[PDB]
Amino acid sequence: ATYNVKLITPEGEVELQVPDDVYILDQAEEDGIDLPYSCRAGSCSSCAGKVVSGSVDQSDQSYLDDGQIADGWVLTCHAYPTSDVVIETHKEEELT
Ligand code: FES
Numbered sequence: 001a002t003y004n005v006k007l008i009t010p011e012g013e014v015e016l017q018v019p020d021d022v023y024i025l026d027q028a029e030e031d032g033i034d035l036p037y038s039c040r041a042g043s044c045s046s047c048a049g050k051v052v053s054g055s056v057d058q059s060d061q062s063y064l065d066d067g068q069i070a071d072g073w074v075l076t077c078h079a080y081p082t083s084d085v086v087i088e089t090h091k092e093e094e095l096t
Contacts (some may be wrong), residue, residue: 004084009080016033020081022080040078047092055081055083069096
């Protein structure tokens with residue numbers, strides 16, 4: 001399947017279609033949309049975002065704890081969409 005992913009960036013909303021087997025960061029980059037990252041391995045805070053609605057699979061990220069996951073935090077470099085999803089990006093500072 002492929003899902004509608006709305007990214008609310010610091011400079012506005014942009015929508016893109018992300019296959020369920022492509023990481024959200026990776027699709028964004030291919031579609032010309034600059035999101036922050038560092039490790040691209042699921043083990044830092046750089047690519048942090050917060051889910052507004054919808055769901056992702058980020059099993060196999062390691063940095064976020066269950067508290068942070070329960071509060072909607074997502075590492076965009078190691079997250080696949082599992083429904084249409086709305087995600088605020090560039091949220092490291094708020095995490096961190
Ligand atoms: S860029 Fe480090 S966890 Fe995503």
